[PDB]
Write a protein that binds this ligand. Structure first.
Ligand code: NA
Ligand code: NA
Lengths: 30, 30, 30
């Protein structure tokens, strides 16, 4: 069942990557 | 170990949805 | 195996916590 977890962690890696950008986006605008 | 990882990963996935929303809110005010 | 996943989670947890702070920061400055 580690594969389901690995895929979720991969999904978490990517969401976190996108949130960092949109936050840094907000940081330049504020 | 294995169960705790899966739970934490699920804990993380929901925190991501909440952050995704908090970021969206902030965008409407930048 | 599991260790790779716990490492990754520890990372995402750090990221999540810092995004939380950054979100808390941006909130205070619209
Ligand atoms: Na929200
Ligand atoms: Na917000």
């Amino acid at each position: 069942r580690m594969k389901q977890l690995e895929d979720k962690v991969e999904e978490l890696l990517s969401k976190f990557y996108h949130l960092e950008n949109e936050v840094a986006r907000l940081k330049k605008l504020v």
